[PDB]
Design a protein around this ligand. Structure first.
Ligand SMILES: CCOC(=O)c1c(/C(C#N)=C\N)c2ccc(Cl)c(Cl)c2n1C
Length: 333
């Protein structure tokens, strides 16, 4: 019964629900018996070396970020305390609401309204830019790691789509999961990110830094806009073929540098468009701007920003400092 509902951590936190599970362990909702029964979130990490290590690294990162930004102006999740419980590192957080992934899924994969996307995108870019300004890269940006502060919603019949639709009262977010976050002068893992959000420099093992987060954010924005991924794959070569269909050919210099020679023939993707997998990619993917659902100026500007975030060469890719000035964001000011 340890670390299951009914267990009590640090003599005050009673587990009442499991909020989510990941490779690291789980996050639970607790009643805090020493603070009037108010609820908190507790991240409970497996007693397995690599997860313990990552959790210690997360704690260090959160102590740095939370000391620099004690009011979470830059929207990183607030750690309240941490402790060990039967060999498990436990990190207590402010209780947040649903992830952006869970909200989309619960809404039947309807995409977010553009005005919500603009607010969420700005907040994500502000947050991650704060990390970048502090010599950190998140490395694991995805919708499941962007959480709403309050996920309360209103429901209205939408006569366009002829279904009921949920709309957030407040779309404010925070960025979570710092267990993979890497300082500039620390060891960089070979493979980072969750596949659908993984930058091409990572796939090609060329080395990565802050730009890989910017590629991930571009992928997130597409997902918010469409309600689905443009990279429906679990294979690296296929992922690269999907990129070529959507974004155009990979740059020759990146291809020349890579040691991932299995993906290439001459200095071109080794991909048969007439194969079954080729037909799949041809059917599911198409040039980026063909995905737009409107040609109005606000949609055009969102897609201009996404295209700059999905620049292949990390040295040329837009920085979040530059992104925060993009005209997509003016209606917020
Ligand atoms: C992969 C499972 O992650 C979550 O379940 C999750 C996560 C994590 C982590 N770590 C990542 N999505 C949470 C981080 C902080 C807070 Cl306050 C909450 Cl409520 C979190 N939850 C619910």
């Amino acid at each position: 019964l340890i670390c299951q509902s009914g267990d009590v951590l640090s003599a005050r936190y009673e587990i009442v629900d499991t909020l989510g599970e990941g490779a690291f362990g789980k996050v639970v909702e607790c009643i805090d018996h020493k603070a009037g029964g108010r609820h908190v979130a507790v991240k409970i990490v497996k007693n397995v070396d690599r997860y313990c290590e990552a959790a210690r690294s997360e704690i260090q990162v959160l102590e740095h970020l939370n000391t620099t930004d004690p009011n979470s102006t830059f929207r990183c999740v607030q750690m309240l305390e941490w402790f060990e419980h039967h060999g498990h590192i436990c990190i207590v957080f402010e209780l947040l609401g649903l992830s952006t992934y869970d909200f989309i899924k619960e809404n039947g994969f309807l995409p977010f309204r553009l005005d919500h996307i603009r607010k969420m995108a700005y907040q994500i870019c502000k947050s991650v830019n704060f990390l970048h300004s502090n010599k950190l890269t998140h490395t694991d940006l995805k919708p499941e790691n962007i959480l709403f502060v309050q996920s309360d919603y209103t429901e209205a019949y939408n006569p366009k789509i002829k279904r009921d639709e949920r709309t957030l009262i407040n779309p404010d977010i925070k960025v979570v999961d710092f267990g993979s976050a890497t300082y500039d002068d620390e060891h960089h893992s070979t493979l980072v990110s969750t596949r659908h959000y993984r930058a091409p420099e990572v796939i090609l093992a060329l080395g990565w830094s802050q730009p890989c987060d910017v590629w991930s954010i571009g992928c997130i924005l597409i997902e918010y806009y469409l309600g689905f991924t443009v990279f429906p794959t679990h294979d690296s070569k296929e992922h690269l073929a999907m990129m070529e269909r959507i974004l155009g050919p990979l740059p020759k210099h990146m291809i020349q540098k890579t040691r991932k020679r299995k993906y290439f023939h001459h200095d071109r993707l080794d991909w048969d468009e007439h194969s079954s997998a080729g037909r799949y990619v041809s059917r599911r993917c198409k040039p980026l701007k063909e995905f737009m659902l409107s040609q109005d100026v606000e949609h055009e500007r969102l897609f201009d920003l996404i295209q700059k975030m999905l620049e292949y060469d990390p040295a040329k890719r837009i920085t979040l400092r530059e992104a925060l000035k993009h005209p997509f964001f003016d209606l917020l000011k």
